[PDB]
């Protein structure tokens, strides 16, 4: 009490309020499932994300809509600051009707200074600058150097942005989503569970480092299309993508960070596999690979080939499945499998196993 | 088919020439010269604060120029700006992509950056007109994961992404002014010189390269590690730098001598290095080995000086204050201990 002062007590009160919201967000993040999604390039993860995350099932959250429209205003400010920089860094000088344009640039800096809300007079002076036909034709020349791809949508709708009434759409956040760099967080709700699918994709070449952050996870979805034995995705003479998938599952399922987290393995294209196994047998590939000529036992044998890649571990169980064109079955299997994983981990935490 | 081979032979000849040069100028090693200085043997530092409020595990931290505020990034979504002297939180920035691997703190105290797995560097403004912390800029010109972000001024940031290149940005413009691309592996760490004229960068191919921000060319290149590099920190004179790796070997490379000086390797460590920091004098060597505890090497005799134990998991990032008052370790047990 002696060391504390008025502002120190108010800072401790703010720290208690912050720690309270921190803990609330932490228990909200503990009431939700985070799960990884690795898949081969031949396999196809997009269709899995589209069937598991229905647009009609999960609408856009109203609370994040203010953050989304703030992103929209920030992209508008970025677009107009790129326009005034292009009219400042222009190699061949272009005549301007207003000499105050450069001061207008500073003015666009001044609205950059506050950035509280949309400034009406800033929209008016940007509209007056855009009224010049040379400023409109400058965008085609600005396409030459490094520029935002989703910039014409904001720079052509400047009068529509100038209206204070605004419409939130999934196309609006798709304009920011189209950059598609990095991991994608797809959020969907099912039976009071908040699933968060993290698909890392083929953006990054080497994974010796950034797999180590995925230690705290619940499931590992692993989508491989078993029709790849005849299909071609080869940077070398190894035409069989199935061996690539076997090495992938051997590197992931036997990894030191994933020694307690299970793998839900999805055989994606089974109808194409059925057609291509009725057309030609799997005996051509390898003899031991061909357990039986029939569809069913081979469909067992492939998943058996994934069951014995787990090197001696009994604390993680491969929940195998065959993907069909039904939204209910796949989401219900993910629900039941992740629920089983959560039950096993919490009972291991209790010590009952 | 033959021109590529003879250019490769010319490159091998140049590597043999620079190896013979650095061997020829290597008459007296540092460990032979430092046998007369008085060694420090008992460096016992006690934890003075254990910061609490992180649900998930820490990946980075960075001290301010005032030695009182320290940023910290974790996976729980909230990037927390701690006040060190009195344990209370100052800001908890909600991140968009919670899979962040780095953070920084501007030398003016205004901005705070963070990269992550989303291949984007989010720079936040703190001293703004409002009380919240808004997303100021989002530098998204990278392809690989970001590993270290550093602030030169409130206008220039240097980032180490995982697409085998570093960048040099202007913040308000949004585009990368300079692209530093000679690395072959994923670039893992940065270290700035105190005069902010040149920086070293460590990749996964054991090559620590010194880049110059003025021109944009690779000034120097160092290769002395068996495994991949995880962390680098300059010497406070700016003429040398320590470098960590997964081969349990800190190595102190020299700039004017253009080679390694000493090797801070013990025999009972089969554990990786995750972060490396120097004190103000540069006598100590704070090394975050991932055997659940930190270690204090002597940067002139390669002797151990103190184990900083007390973390339940891997120490992910540690930093010494800019005045030298303390050193804070952030580990995967979600704690931020301040050893003094």
């Amino acid at each position: 009490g002696c060391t504390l002062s008025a502002e120190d007590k108010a800072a401790v009160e703010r720290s208690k309020m912050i720690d309270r919201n921190l803990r609330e967000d932490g228990e909200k993040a503990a009431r939700e499932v985070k799960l990884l999604l690795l898949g081969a390039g031949e396999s196809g993860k997009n269709t899995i994300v589209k069937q598991m995350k229905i647009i009609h099932e999960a609408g856009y959250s109203e609370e994040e809509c203010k953050q989304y429209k703030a992103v929209v205003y920030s992209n508008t400010i970025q677009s107009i600051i790129a326009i005034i920089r292009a009219m400042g860094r222009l190699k061949i000088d272009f005549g301007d009707s207003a000499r105050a344009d450069d001061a207008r640039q500073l003015f666009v800096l001044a609205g950059a200074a506050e950035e509280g809300f949309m400034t009406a007079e800033l929209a008016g002076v940007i509209k007056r600058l855009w009224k010049d036909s040379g400023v409109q034709a400058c965008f085609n020349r600005s396409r030459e150097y490094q520029l935002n791809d989703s910039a014409a949508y904001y720079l052509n709708d400047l009068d529509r942005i100038a209206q204070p009434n605004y419409i939130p759409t999934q196309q609006d956040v798709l304009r920011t989503r189209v950059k598609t760099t990095g991991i994608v967080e797809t959020h969907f709700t099912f039976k009071d569970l908040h699933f968060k699918m993290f698909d890392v994709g083929a953006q990054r070449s080497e994974r010796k480092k950034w797999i180590h952050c995925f230690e705290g996870v619940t499931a590992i979805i692993f989508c491989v299309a078993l029709s790849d034995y005849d299909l071609v995705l080869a940077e070398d003479e190894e035409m069989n993508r199935m061996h690539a998938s076997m090495k992938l599952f051997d590197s992931i399922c036997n990894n030191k960070w994933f020694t307690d987290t299970s793998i839900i393995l999805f055989l994606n294209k089974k109808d194409l596999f059925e057609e291509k196994i009725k057309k030609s047998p799997l005996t051509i590939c390898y003899p031991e690979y061909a357990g039986s000529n029939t569809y069913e036992e081979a469909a067992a044998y492939i998943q058996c080939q994934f069951e014995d890649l787990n090197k001696r571990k009994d604390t993680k169980e491969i929940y195998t499945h065959f993907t069909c064109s039904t939204d209910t079955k796949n989401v219900q299997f993910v629900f039941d499998a992740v629920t089983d994983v959560i039950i096993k981990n919490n009972l291991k935490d209790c010590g009952l196993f | 088919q033959s021109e590529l081979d003879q250019l490769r032979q010319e490159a091998e000849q140049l590597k043999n020439q620079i190896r013979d040069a650095r061997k020829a100028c290597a008459d007296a090693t540092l460990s032979q010269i430092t046998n007369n200085i008085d060694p420090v043997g008992r460096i016992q530092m006690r934890t003075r604060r254990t910061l609490r409020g992180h649900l998930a595990k820490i990946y980075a931290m960075h001290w301010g120029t005032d030695s009182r505020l320290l940023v910290s990034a974790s996976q729980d979504g909230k990037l927390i700006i701690w006040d060190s002297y009195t344990t209370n939180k100052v800001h908890a920035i909600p991140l968009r992509s919670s899979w962040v691997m780095t953070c920084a703190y501007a030398p003016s105290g205004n901005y705070v950056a963070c990269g992550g797995l989303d291949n984007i560097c989010s720079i936040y403004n703190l001293k703004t007109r409002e009380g919240n912390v808004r997303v100021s800029r989002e530098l998204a010109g990278h392809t690989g994961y970001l590993s270290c972000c550093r602030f030169l001024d409130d206008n220039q940031i240097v980032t180490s992404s995982g697409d085998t290149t570093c960048a040099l940005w202007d913040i308000e413009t949004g585009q990368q002014t300079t692209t530093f691309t000679g690395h072959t592996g994923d670039v893992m760490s940065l270290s700035l010189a105190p005069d902010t004229r040149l920086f070293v960068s460590g990749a996964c191919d054991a090559s620590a390269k010194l880049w110059d921000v003025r021109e944009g060319m690779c000034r120097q290149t160092f290769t002395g590690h068996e495994s991949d590099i995880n962390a680098i920190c300059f010497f406070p004179n700016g003429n040398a730098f320590a470098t960590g790796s997964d081969d349990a070997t800190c190595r102190l490379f020299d700039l004017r001598a253009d080679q390694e000086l000493m090797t801070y390797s013990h025999d009972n460590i089969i554990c990786g290095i995750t972060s490396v920091s120097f004190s103000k004098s540069g006598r100590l060597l704070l090394a975050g080995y991932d055997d659940f505890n930190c270690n204090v090497w002597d940067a002139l005799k390669a002797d151990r000086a103190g184990v900083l134990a007390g973390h339940d998991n891997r120490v992910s990032c540690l930093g010494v204050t800019d005045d030298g008052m303390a050193v804070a370790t952030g580990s995967w047990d979600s704690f931020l201990k301040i050893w003094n």
Partner: single-chain antibody
Amino acid sequence: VQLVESGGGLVQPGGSRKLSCSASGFAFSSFGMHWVRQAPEKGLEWVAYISSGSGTIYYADTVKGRFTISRDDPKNTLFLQMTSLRSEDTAMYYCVRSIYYYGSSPFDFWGQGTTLTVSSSDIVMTQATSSVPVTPGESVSISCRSSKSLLHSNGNTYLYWFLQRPGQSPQLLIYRMSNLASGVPDRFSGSGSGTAFTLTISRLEAEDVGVYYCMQHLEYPLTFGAGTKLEL
């Protein structure tokens, strides 16, 4: 940053009145809010304070119990309900923002000031000077004497300097008598050690005239200064 407060102006003494302050333009949900009286032809004086999230409420000694106060976060509004008004409460009321962290500038923004007229221990901040006539363009020195050593153990001396233009609202211009506020030009400096503090103006301008207040923020209640005015 817009604070518009309303309520009152012709109130019978002994009756209740509820004043509403709308807060638009900032994160109101994490701001402790203060109130400030200003009697006609007299100095400013503190009323009450609400912490962030309404955790800890403080009142002044002379208005304790008679007033009640509330914060509505989803509408971003602040309500001051005053019961059993006295004949000395005829004043202009200011509802001001405040945020408390290291390097923060609380009391930085001021309301326009609502008017409320009625029909009819403490750290005393003894400002000796009250009016200094001076021409524009010279160094001006305003002294502020306290009654308690404001130098706390943690090293920062909790005294703030405030500028109020004639016919306008007050404005924070110096916090903790070393640092300058976000928006003031680099002309105003603060010096002194614990007992006595000094505001030094390098060059004076047409916008630099007004009344200067000094506030101690070491202990509640926040007793203000008399207010030294500058005329030309």
